[PDB]
RNA sequence: CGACACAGGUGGUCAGGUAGAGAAUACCAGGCGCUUGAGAGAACUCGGGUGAAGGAACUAGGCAAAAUGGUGCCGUAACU
RNA sequence: GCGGAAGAUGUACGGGGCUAAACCAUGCACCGAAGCUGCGGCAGCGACGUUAUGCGUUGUUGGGUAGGGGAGCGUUCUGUAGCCUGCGAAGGUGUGCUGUGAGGCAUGCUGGAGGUAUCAGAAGUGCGAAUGCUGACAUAAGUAACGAUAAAGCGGGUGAAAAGCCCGCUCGCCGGAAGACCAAGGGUUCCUGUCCAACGUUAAUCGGGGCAGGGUGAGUCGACCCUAAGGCGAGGCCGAAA
RNA sequence: CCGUGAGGGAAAGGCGAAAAGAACCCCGGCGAGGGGAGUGAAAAAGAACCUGAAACCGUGUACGUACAAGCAGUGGGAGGCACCUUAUGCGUGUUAUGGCGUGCCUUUUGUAUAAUGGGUCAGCGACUUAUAUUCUGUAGCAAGGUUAACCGGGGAGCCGAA
RNA sequence: CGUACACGGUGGAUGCCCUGGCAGUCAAGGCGAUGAAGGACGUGCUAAUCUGCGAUAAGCGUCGGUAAGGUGAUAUGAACCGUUUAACCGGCGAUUUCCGAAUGGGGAACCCCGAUCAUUAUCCAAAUGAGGCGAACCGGGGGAACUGAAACAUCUAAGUAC
């Protein structure tokens, strides 16, 4: 008796959308969308997080990488910088010592002394 | 020119469709004259009167007038009762195709 | 009749049309061509023919196939 | 450490490989989690004070299948108050914004007639998940299948078109029979003319196809008539009677 | 329409205000159809003809793509190509390459599982009535309270009051 | 060849409409031997269906109403009817084939008569009755089982189904 209305045929859609990033089916199918999204919302349920204290094994493992070729490194190069100035955070840092063959020593001539 | 309900198959139309999209009018003309399918009439009989209508009506030159776009997509499927197998009953879900074809200078 | 223009099923009369013991093959009369096509000289499968020498050694069993097979004369056992 | 230790399509510690990147006794410095510490943010429960679920302070801090408890968005229609619309609604498609979310909202196109918000109700009220039911559809495939009455072939005619419509010739098939006459049964399918969209497992100017007309004129043929096994109705006889 | 018969038993709604339902012309074997043209606010109404979605078909567009390994993402950094109706170092379409990643549902102690079910889709598809009893939350009034049949009255009668 | 979209198609959902259903209420309520109900076959200029009639055949007559148009659903062609007022809507009368309770007899609608039982009886069927139909309600007789009792022989379902 009651139509079944804005719900189913109007759940088929505003689903099989949003798969910008789909795959051969489960974007063209329902019963696969559903199941298939739902390993999305979970599997990551509150992990792209992951990637911080992940890939940051390195900016600190890379942070030698940028001393050790101008004295010591690693070891003692995070440990000056928290001695005299207003120590710089380190997040870009440990990143910069790189792609830049500047700066990089700009925290290499600051410790080693003040040591 | 286009057309409408023609018992082809739309599958094994746009076949003979192709290699008759390219230039040239009469390159479309020597081959279609031999195909060996019976996708070659009706599929024939226009992009025939498709030139023409195009020579008068919408003025244009036989000698310039190439074959741009030809596309085959129409229907519809009718109920039809026809006998398969030696005893039973089926409803074929046979399709159609329209040969439209416009054929202007190049 | 069998759901179908289903090689299934369905009574009677014509059993002297012409050559053989005969209502057995070939052929008048009469009827019919209404049991999907085209192009090289394969393997394999369905029916069938012929195969040297041995010849049932195959097999549950000679199954299958083959042999004998018309007519006349001679001749013909145990058993009953 | 070695002997004892023999097996199945190419043999190894995760591998490279290593005499130390082995093993044992000690030692130093580091890497390394949603653990511990710390900033901000959401919440919940409980405690204290309180009219307060408003503040202040405090404890745990806050994982959960079965199960218990509690709040909410959306839908249909009927109320009051109150609005929108052909200077265009609902719906649909694509897109922007907001909410933890259910969901709400806006823009463009289409559509082209109605459709809402608040509070209070009414509900045959919101689904992927039964060899489930019905309809539709894709892949499979343009793939498996057409054979004793195995018969057609060469010219010609007609035609827009003819391998199977027609003519001639040649060549064959059947013979208790694909010959002739009939019962039952079927029943106009018969004939002529005009056609072919449908039917004729290809084509057709052909048809037992489609349409329109036409055809089946007995005293002695058959029915009609009669009866057989047997059946029925009426009188007679049995709770009752078909 | 099916079955000898008893019996069984579908599906198919809507052109437009008016038909006012395409005159005339070209094409074609053809009252088919096509083109052009006409009517009307609109035919992107021309006749199972309002609107007209999904599965799906063809074509075409964007972007890949015949060394390539497989859930087909997330984050980071590089490549490009294409488009600047949401101007702002801000996004899309698809995508090359690289690091990871064994559909989804019941049963079971344990299933991704050589355990069962589904080819796909849409629609369909499963806790409801009176009465009586016993609790609970909310609300009115309080040894009184409620009526039933039938009349806006009734108290019969029921429960409670040792 | 994978995905998204665009144009066209398929398909038919969706939205809107609905000359249909479903449900409740009030009123009204029997038909047939002067042969009904039902069925068959016919009947309109052309008509195949449906409807209406029936060989005076989608009709005839009378009165009243109504009204100038009409010839049923079909808005076709031809033709015709109406003001000697029809079409259309209401009482009473006439006609009313054959079978059918039929009832002479037989019979798948065809051929020849009050059949059968019974009462009265002028015992002559002469005068009469019965023999059928109808949605389910009331009455009078006959009378289960599945099932419940989580088995089952009382009991129960039932005095129900038939």
Same mark, same amino acid.
């Given at each position: 008796?009651?139509?079944?209305? *804005? %719900?189913?045929?109007?759940?088929?859609?505003?689903?099989?959308?949003?798969?910008?990033?789909?795959?051969?089916?489960?974007?063209? *199918?329902?019963? *696969?969308? =559903?199941?298939?999204?739902?390993?999305?919302?979970?599997?990551?349920?509150?992990?792209?997080?992951?990637?911080?204290?992940?890939?940051?094994?390195?900016? %600190?493992?890379?942070?030698?990488? @940028?001393?050790?070729?101008?004295?010591?490194?690693?070891?003692?190069?995070?440990?000056?910088?928290?001695?005299?100035?207003?120590? %710089?955070?380190?997040?870009?840092?440990?990143?910069?010592?790189?792609?830049?063959?500047?700066? =990089?020593?700009?925290? *290499?001539?600051? @410790?080693? @002394? @003040?040591? | 020119?286009?057309?409408?309900?023609? /018992?082809?198959?739309?599958?094994?139309?746009?076949?003979?469709?192709?290699?008759?999209?390219?230039?040239?009018?009469?390159?479309?003309?020597?081959?279609?004259?031999?195909?060996?399918?019976?996708?070659?009439?009706? &599929?024939?009989?226009?992009?025939?009167?498709?030139?023409?209508?195009?020579?008068?009506?919408?003025?244009?030159?036989?000698?310039?007038?190439? &074959?741009?776009?030809?596309?085959?997509?129409?229907? !519809?499927?009718?109920? /039809?009762?026809? !006998? /398969?197998?030696?005893?039973?009953?089926?409803?074929?879900?046979?399709?159609?195709?329209?040969?439209?074809?416009?054929?202007?200078? /190049?």
């Amino acid at each position: 008796r009651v139509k079944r209305g *804005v %719900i189913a045929r109007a759940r088929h859609k505003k689903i099989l959308k949003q798969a910008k990033g789909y795959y051969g089916a489960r974007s063209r *199918v329902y019963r *696969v969308a =559903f199941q298939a999204v739902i390993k999305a919302g979970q599997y990551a349920y509150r992990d792209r997080r992951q990637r911080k204290r992940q890939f940051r094994q390195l900016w %600190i493992a890379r942070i030698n990488a @940028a001393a050790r070729q101008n004295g010591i490194s690693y070891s003692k190069f995070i440990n000056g910088l928290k001695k005299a100035s207003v120590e %710089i955070d380190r997040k870009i840092l440990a990143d910069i010592a790189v792609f830049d063959k500047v700066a =990089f020593t700009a925290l *290499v001539e600051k @410790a080693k @002394a @003040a040591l | 020119a286009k057309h409408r309900h023609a /018992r082809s198959s739309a599958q094994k139309v746009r076949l003979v469709a192709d290699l008759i999209r390219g230039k040239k009018v009469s390159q479309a003309l020597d081959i279609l004259t031999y195909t060996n399918k019976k996708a070659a009439v009706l &599929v024939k009989k226009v992009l025939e009167s498709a030139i023409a209508n195009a020579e008068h009506n919408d003025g244009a030159d036989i000698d310039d007038l190439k &074959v741009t776009k030809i596309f085959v997509d129409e229907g !519809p499927s009718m109920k /039809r009762i026809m !006998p /398969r197998a030696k005893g039973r009953a089926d409803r074929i879900l046979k399709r159609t195709s329209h040969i439209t074809v416009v054929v202007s200078d /190049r």
